[PDB]
């Protein structure tokens, strides 16, 4: 494991987790290029504080559920790539109805460039203690639809709610939100703003 990095569940002791890029279930379809390991490797200071994050949803009894931490510079080519394919039709209804490969990137929801590779930006959502359930969002994580916009309006009154609660409880621990992605968090005093790493995710 490189220098200053963990899989953040060992820091973040009962936190869940699906490392989707990790896995067939993400908008490729197939594991992501750098992502040999299903778990979610962060920057020590994402751990840090999402670990104020995992405490502090004590504001209800929200659990997280990771989804995607530090990402490999070749995930982000691998998506690239991917968006540059023919479509097969294969996740286009689950990812992104509405648009299509090269929209995600002009749109902003797939980025040339992320801060994913920094080491301290995550995705995750909530679930219910109590219940154990997920809490209702509106839009599945990777969506890449206006309706995974923050402020985004088709989506119910409890799921825009759910929404802002996650975005609170984030921007409560150290993290700053980003508008057109409800899952999208990046640690606000970040250590490697302008590092781009590359080392696997192994
Ligand atoms: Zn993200």
Redesign the pocket.
């Known amino acids: 494991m490189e220098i200053g990095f963990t899989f953040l569940d060992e820091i973040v002791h009962g936190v869940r987790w699906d490392a989707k890029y990790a896995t067939w279930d993400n908008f490729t379809g197939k594991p992501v290029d750098g992502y040999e390991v299903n778990r979610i490797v962060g920057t020590y200071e994402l751990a840090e504080s999402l670990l104020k994050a995992k405490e502090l949803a004590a504001t209800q009894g929200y659990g997280l559920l990771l989804?995607?931490g530090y990402?490999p510079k070749r995930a982000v080519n691998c998506f690239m790539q991917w968006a540059a394919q023919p479509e097969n039709n294969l996740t286009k209804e689950s990812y992104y109805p509405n648009i299509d490969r090269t929209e995600m990137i002009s749109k902003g929801y797939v980025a040339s460039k992320?801060?994913?590779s920094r080491g301290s930006?995550?995705?995750l959502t909530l679930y219910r203690l109590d219940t154990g359930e997920l809490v209702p969002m509106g839009s599945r994580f990777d969506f890449m639809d206006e309706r995974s916009h923050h402020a985004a309006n088709g989506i119910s009154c409890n799921e825009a709610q759910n929404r802002r609660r996650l975005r609170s409880i984030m921007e409560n621990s150290g993290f700053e939100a980003?508008s057109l992605?409800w899952?999208?968090?990046?640690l606000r005093d970040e250590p490697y703003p302008n590092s781009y790493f590359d080392f696997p995710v192994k």
Not at 183 to 186: A, E, G, L, M, Q
């Open positions: 989804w995607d990402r992320s801060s994913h930006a995550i995705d980003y992605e899952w999208h968090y990046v």
